[PDB]
Amino acid sequence: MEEEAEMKAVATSPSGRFLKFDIELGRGAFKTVYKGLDTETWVEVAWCELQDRKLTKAEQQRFKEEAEMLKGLQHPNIVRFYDSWESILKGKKCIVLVTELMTSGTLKTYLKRFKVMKPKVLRSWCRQILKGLQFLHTRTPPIIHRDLKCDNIFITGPTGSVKIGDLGLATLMRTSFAKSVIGTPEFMAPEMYEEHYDESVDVYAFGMCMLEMATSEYPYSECQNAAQIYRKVTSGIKPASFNKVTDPEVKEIIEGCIRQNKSERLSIRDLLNHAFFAEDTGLRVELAEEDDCSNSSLALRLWVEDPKKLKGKHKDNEAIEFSFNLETDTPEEVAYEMVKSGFFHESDSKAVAKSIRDRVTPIKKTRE
């Protein structure tokens, strides 16, 4: 039984397609989001009201057209923008943005409580933010998100896909004041407060999102306030949580993204070509426990990411926990022990041994 019958429509788009309900979903300076309805599809939408009062006639016409540019953005990793128009709020001009309503919330809400699910969702959500950003940066003229952070990444579900939303509008962030209210220091590149920055601010913010997804903790939480973060960021002092990244590949991508010098930062084109984003083997090995160099034995986990890529009747999300002595063991012999125990068919030995070798050869080198 639905009580959608009691929700009274309080406004309509000039087109007539969308209805506004007086149910506020979120706030912020310059923005109020409302529950809305599409009368063509009968699906609840977000009715967003955007307004900067202290805006000139010239600035307002540039903000209205920036809003109209978003309508033509269609990509599976970008929240869909259905329509935008100019209206009046408290006598002054305002912009209304109608967008898809994300019911499973943000990545920020998700990471407050939950770790990203295993075996593949971390790699997928990363690749999806990169694909979404790449799409925005390849528009004519290029779009820069300007406000990328976990609270602006929406999830379809814990095993679903991610969508970037709440783009930072160029005209709405022209000033140091607007940037200080809109932006989240943790996710902001050091050059964010300069009058001129490019798309590499979005790369820096991506690096911080990925850090948060990897460490399951908030970047720069050691800081008491935003001034301390600004001081640390501009000094070239990484978040303490960066040294909590246990995967060398994940630590490498992050550092290449959160580089102080904008020109030294990694490009999305090349990131998308990183081996970390490959899924050809269908097998991956990770550390199960925190590695103490006093120990000779590691505690590892083998993930069957793709049961189709293997001979036999394998279940989804299959994870094998096994020990490995860095001194006396070999990946090829351990893969044979997996075959013998009945985990794998003999013909998958080479694929198993490689997944083990990939994780175990770097750690063995580090040992003294």
Task: Give the technique used to solve this structure.
Answer: X-ray
DSSP labels for 163-198? EE-----GGGG-SHHHHHHH--GGG--GGGGSS---
Strand-by-strand arrangement of the 283-287 sheet: 283-287, 297-304, 318-325
- Please state, in angstroms and as integers, the Cα–Cα distance from residue 57 to each residue in 21, 84, 173, 184, 361, following that order: 29, 18, 16, 29, 63
Do the annotations mark residue 102 as ligand-binding? yes
Amino acid at 273: N
**302 contacts: CB under 8 Å, gap ≥ 6:** 283, 284, 285, 319, 320, 321, 322, 338, 352, 355, 356
CATH superfamily to which 102-278 belongs: Transferase(Phosphotransferase) domain 1 (1.10.510.10)
279-368 in CATH: which number? 3.10.20.90
Q: In Å, what resolution does this model reach?
A: 2.4
Residue 35, marked binder = no
Query: Does the annotation list 281 as a binding residue?
Result: no
Confirm whether residue 1 is marked as ligand binding.
no
Please tell me the distance from the alpha carbon of residue 297 to that of residue 303, in angstroms, as a whole number.
Answer: 19
Q: How many angstroms separate the CA atoms of 94 and 52, rounded?
A: 7
Nearest to 210 by CA among 133, 287, 310, 292: 133
Spans of all domains in the chain: 1-101, 102-278, 279-368
Residue 278: both structure tokens together: 């490959």
* 246 is annotated as contributing to ligand binding: no
Annotated catalytic residues are 166
Domain 1-101, CATH class in plain words: alpha beta
Q: Is the peptide bond before 331 cis (omega within 30 degrees of 0)?
A: no
